[PDB]
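queue> holo job accepted (NAP)
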Amino acid sequence: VGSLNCIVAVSQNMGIGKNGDLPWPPLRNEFRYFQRMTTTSSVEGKQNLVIMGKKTWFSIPEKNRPLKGRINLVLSRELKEPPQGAHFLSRSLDDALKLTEQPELANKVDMVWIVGGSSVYKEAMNHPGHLKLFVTRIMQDFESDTFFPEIDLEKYKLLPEYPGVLSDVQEEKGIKYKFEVYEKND
Ligand SMILES: NC(=O)c1ccc[n+]([C@@H]2O[C@H](COP(=O)([O-])OP(=O)(O)OC[C@H]3O[C@@H](n4cnc5c(N)ncnc54)[C@H](OP(=O)(O)O)[C@@H]3O)[C@@H](O)[C@H]2O)c1
Ligand SMILES: CCc1nc(N)nc(N)c1OCCCOc1ccccc1C[C@H](C)C(N)=O
Ligand SMILES: [Cl-]
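queue> job finished
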């Protein structure tokens, strides 16, 4: 199994969601970035695994569940079986990562991507070991009710460039943003 990664888009006031949707209007190329990064596997015959909370799963329109071309896993302690469309359901990120050692996943999974929300990010960033954060910095405030935990800059390095990721300011629909990659290995 490959590397452990988070991917998120974050407003200046650290917001990631409002009313079960994004706090900002749709940004087509931000979405394309999320889709390409989480879907692309370096290894033939393997797919990446996306791990998400329950509310994030239900924020995806039904026509797009599960996330195409990726193995989908949902975190919840209330659900007793994976929701319709999904096939994996774990009680915690710790359990999900242990699940990727069992045969049903060990030979199928390349990279692991955590795709939200708030408490999935929080469990990952306290997880020990090699971890990358792919953070889109949306350069405006947006009203939000779900937030991204602040990055401990004593644990993470900010990479100046990352392969396949442009590092200049992006802009669509009047909104400037920037792709950042953080990395730790404790
Ligand atoms: N901007 C972005 O990058 C981004 C990414 C994803 C989502 N969003 C948006 O953020 C909102 C959804 O995110 P959210 O934080 O509100 O909800 P969420 O994290 O997707 O789901 C919350 C539920 O999922 C379970 N859960 C979450 N973390 C868990 C963990 N570490 N271990 C075990 N279970 C866990 C729990 O389910 P149980 O109560 O059943 O145990 C929790 O109640 C939406 O508005 C979405 O549009 C934005
Ligand atoms: C683009 C937002 C984003 N960007 C970064 N960089 N990282 C993330 N984790 C992230 O969230 C992705 C969460 C999955 O959402 C999907 C996936 C497929 C179809 C529809 C939706 C819901 C749409 C986007 C919505 N409006 O909620
Ligand atoms: Cl931060």
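queue> The longest strand covers residues 175-185.
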